[model samples]
Target: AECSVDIQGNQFNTNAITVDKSCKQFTVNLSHPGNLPKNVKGHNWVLSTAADMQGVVTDGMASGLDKDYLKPDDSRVIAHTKLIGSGEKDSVTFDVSKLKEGEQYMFFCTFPGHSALEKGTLTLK
Candidate 1:
């Protein structure tokens, strides 16, 4: 919702996502409403422990756009959606069990330096 995070200025319209354990699973939906291509301005939803946020971005950059800018088979990555440009949409899901109620987790975009504003916290309810 609200493009996941504010891409232009400070205008957050989404709330913290809190899913119950009984749900078994949860889905993250992302889409870009603009008209630019990925190379010009791509976006993705990557999930990982809060501690691994910077590391994920570092390794992801080395991984490059060929692989959605994320390391393939990275254990730190709980889940991620395919990279998308404007006019595109992606849905990613992960088991609820993958996240414990007390743990810290985050969702962000690894498209170059977008993480500075394109990131948010996720929680288990």
Candidate 2:
């Protein structure tokens, strides 16, 4: 369904997403087609509320790669995928039951500065 988001060293394909609120589950698959390695330009998909996005990402940046650039068992993080290198792929699935019916959500890459450009939205169906 062309859900894959292309990742380069400092760029992303799109910055927004919207989903039906009735879906039972949601999935995000990321593909890194760039030449840079994961460490230098790795990417991972992370989900959180619009209000919590910045703070969660800020703390994640300090969490390091081993932790997938996210805090340990962070409640604010609704879902996330493992950090992947170039030519690699990763996916994240979260139950739609966890999402509020009328609430809007945003997803982004937690790779340091990537969020500024790689952010997107996901509306519950």
What are the lDDT scores of the predictions, listed in order? 0.77, 0.77
Query: Candidate 2 lDDT, tens digit per residue, 1-125?
Result: 23233333345566666555556777777788788888898888888888999988999999998888898889999888889887898877677777886687888889898888788776654
Off by over 4 Å in 2: 1-10
TM match of model 1 to true structure:
0.86
My TM-score estimates for the predictions, one after another, are 0.86, 0.86
lDDT at 45 for candidate 2? 82
* lDDT for each residue of candidate 1 in 14-48, tens digit (9 for 90 to 100): 43556666767778777776788998888888889
Candidate 2, overall lDDT? 0.77
Candidate 1, position 83, lDDT: 85
What is the Å distance of residue 108 in model 2 from its true position? Answer: 0.6
Q: Model 2: what TM-score?
A: 0.86
